mmCIF file of C-alpha atoms in Angstrom:
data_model
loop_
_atom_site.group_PDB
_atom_site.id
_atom_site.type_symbol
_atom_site.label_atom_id
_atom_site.label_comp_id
_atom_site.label_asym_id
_atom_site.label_seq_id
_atom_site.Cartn_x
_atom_site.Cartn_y
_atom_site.Cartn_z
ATOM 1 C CA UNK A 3202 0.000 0.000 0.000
ATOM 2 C CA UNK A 3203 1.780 3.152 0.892
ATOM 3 C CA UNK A 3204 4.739 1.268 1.655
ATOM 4 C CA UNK A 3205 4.304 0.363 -2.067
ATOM 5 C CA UNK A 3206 3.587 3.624 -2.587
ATOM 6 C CA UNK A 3207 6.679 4.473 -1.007
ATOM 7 C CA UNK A 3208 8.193 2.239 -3.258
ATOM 8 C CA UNK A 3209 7.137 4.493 -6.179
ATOM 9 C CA UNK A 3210 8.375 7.483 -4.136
ATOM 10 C CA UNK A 3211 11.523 6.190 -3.978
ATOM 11 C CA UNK A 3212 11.251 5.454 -7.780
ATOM 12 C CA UNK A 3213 10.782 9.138 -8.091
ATOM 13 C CA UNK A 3214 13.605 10.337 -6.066
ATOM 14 C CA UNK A 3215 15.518 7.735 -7.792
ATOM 15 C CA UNK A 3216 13.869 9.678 -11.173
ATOM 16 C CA UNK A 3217 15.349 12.945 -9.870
ATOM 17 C CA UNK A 3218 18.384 12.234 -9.267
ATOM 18 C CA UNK A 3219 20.529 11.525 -12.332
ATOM 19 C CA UNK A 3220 18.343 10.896 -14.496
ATOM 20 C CA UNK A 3221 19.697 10.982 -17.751
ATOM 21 C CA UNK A 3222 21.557 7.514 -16.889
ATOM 22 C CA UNK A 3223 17.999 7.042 -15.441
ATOM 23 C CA UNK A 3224 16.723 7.277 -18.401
ATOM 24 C CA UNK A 3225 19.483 5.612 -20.652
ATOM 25 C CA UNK A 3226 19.115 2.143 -18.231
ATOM 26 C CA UNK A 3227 15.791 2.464 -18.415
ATOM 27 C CA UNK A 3228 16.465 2.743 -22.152
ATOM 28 C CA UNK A 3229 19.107 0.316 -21.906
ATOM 29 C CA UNK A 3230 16.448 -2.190 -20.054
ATOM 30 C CA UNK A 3231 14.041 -2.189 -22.624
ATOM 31 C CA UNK A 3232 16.376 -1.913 -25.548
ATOM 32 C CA UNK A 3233 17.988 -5.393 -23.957
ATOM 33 C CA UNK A 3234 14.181 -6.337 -23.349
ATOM 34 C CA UNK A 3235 13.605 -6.536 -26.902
ATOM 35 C CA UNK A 3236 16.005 -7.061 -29.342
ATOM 36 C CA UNK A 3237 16.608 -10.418 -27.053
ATOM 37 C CA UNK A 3238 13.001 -11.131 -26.782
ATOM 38 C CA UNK A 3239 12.589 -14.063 -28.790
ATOM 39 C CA UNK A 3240 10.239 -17.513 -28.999
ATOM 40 C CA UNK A 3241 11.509 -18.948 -32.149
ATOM 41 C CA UNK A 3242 9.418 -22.449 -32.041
ATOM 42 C CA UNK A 3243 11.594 -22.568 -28.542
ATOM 43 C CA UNK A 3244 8.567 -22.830 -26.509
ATOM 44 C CA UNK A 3245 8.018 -26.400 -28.644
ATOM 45 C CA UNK A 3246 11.140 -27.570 -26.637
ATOM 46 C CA UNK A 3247 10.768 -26.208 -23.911
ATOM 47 C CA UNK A 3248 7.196 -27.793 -24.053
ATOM 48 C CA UNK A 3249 8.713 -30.939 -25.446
ATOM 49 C CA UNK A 3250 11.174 -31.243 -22.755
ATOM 50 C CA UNK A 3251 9.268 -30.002 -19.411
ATOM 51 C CA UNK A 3252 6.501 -32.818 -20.442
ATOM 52 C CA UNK A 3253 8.676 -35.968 -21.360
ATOM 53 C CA UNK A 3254 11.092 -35.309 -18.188
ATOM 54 C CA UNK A 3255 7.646 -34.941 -15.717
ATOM 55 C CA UNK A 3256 6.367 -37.633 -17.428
ATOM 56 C CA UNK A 3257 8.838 -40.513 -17.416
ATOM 57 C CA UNK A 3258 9.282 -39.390 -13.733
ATOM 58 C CA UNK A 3259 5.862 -40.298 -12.697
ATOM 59 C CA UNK A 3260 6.304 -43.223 -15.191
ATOM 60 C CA UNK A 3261 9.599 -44.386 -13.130
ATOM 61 C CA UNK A 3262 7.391 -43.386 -9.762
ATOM 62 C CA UNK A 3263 5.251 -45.773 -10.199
ATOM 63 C CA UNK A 3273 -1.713 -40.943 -17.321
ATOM 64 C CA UNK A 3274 -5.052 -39.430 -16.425
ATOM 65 C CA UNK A 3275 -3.998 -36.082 -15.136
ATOM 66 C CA UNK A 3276 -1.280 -36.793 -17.698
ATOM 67 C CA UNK A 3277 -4.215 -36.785 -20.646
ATOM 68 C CA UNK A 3278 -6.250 -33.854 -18.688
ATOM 69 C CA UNK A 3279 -2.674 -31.646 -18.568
ATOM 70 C CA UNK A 3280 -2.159 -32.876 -22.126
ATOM 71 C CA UNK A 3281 -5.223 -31.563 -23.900
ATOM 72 C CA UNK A 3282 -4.242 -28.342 -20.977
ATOM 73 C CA UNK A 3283 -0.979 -27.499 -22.559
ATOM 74 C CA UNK A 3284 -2.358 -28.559 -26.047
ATOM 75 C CA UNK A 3285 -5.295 -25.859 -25.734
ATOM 76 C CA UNK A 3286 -2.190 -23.263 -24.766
ATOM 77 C CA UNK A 3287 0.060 -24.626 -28.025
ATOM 78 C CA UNK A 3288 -2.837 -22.186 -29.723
ATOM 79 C CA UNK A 3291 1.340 -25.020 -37.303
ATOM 80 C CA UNK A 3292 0.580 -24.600 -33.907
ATOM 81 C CA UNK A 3293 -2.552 -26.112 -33.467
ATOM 82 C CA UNK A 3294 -2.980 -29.457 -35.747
ATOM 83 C CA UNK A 3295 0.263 -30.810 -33.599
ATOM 84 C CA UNK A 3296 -0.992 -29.773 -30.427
ATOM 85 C CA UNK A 3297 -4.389 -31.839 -31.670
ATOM 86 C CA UNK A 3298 -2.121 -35.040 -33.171
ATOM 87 C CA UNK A 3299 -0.207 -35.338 -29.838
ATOM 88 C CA UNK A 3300 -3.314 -34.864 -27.684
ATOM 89 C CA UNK A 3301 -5.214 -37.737 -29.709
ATOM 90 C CA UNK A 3302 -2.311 -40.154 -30.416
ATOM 91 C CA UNK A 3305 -2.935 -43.086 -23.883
ATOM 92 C CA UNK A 3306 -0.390 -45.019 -21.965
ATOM 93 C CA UNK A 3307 2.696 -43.759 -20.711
ATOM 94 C CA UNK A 3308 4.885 -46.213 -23.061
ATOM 95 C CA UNK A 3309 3.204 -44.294 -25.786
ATOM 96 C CA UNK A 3310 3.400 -41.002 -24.729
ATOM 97 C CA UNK A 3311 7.031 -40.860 -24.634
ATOM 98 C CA UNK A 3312 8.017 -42.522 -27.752
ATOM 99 C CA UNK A 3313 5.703 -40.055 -29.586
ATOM 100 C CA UNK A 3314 7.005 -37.250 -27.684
ATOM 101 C CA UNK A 3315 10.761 -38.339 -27.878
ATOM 102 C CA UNK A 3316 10.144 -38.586 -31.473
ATOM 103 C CA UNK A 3317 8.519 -35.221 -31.755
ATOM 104 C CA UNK A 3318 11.743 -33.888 -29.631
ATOM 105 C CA UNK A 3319 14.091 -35.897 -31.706
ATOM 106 C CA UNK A 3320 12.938 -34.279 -34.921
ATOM 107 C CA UNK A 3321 12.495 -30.821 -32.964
ATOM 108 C CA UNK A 3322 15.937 -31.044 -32.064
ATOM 109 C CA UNK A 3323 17.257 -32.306 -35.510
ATOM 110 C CA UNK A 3324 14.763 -29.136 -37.165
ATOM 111 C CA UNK A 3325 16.536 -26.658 -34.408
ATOM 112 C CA UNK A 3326 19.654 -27.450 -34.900
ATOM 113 C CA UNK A 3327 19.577 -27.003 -38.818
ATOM 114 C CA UNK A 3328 19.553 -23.295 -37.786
#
């Protein structure tokens, strides 16, 4: 509250004092924020990986929360879509990672053609 408000004050007595650097960070920050900001089908392994490594886990622990995350993550994979669909539809684990080792063995093979 006014502790975060505070916060803000000290934002602008950090504005008031030298501010032209304040400014050229700031600039800096967002000029760094964007020219770096970048999802170039990189979500797809990151999606690829964070699923097969939770999923072989569980697998080793021991898929219904595994099939009601999968048609989750699917939905936010919004190309993009028809894959999302054809690994949601393609279960048992067994399954589920040799499609999606597959899918991250061409993903990887595609990404590193770059």
């Amino acid at each position: 509250r006014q502790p975060w408000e505070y916060l803000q004050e000290l934002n602008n007595i950090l504005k008031t004092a030298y501010p032209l650097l304040a400014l050229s960070l700031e600039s800096l920050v967002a000029q760094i924020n964007d020219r770096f900001k970048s999802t170039t089908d990189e979500d797809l392994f990151r999606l690829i990986n964070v699923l097969l490594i939770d999923g072989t886990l569980n697998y080793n622990r021991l898929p219904e929360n595994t099939e009601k995350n999968l048609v989750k993550f699917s939905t936010t994979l919004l190309y993009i879509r028809p894959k999302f669909n054809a690994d949601f539809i393609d279960p048992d684990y067994e399954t589920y990672i040799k499609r999606l080792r597959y899918w991250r063995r061409r993903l990887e093979n595609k990404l590193d053609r770059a």
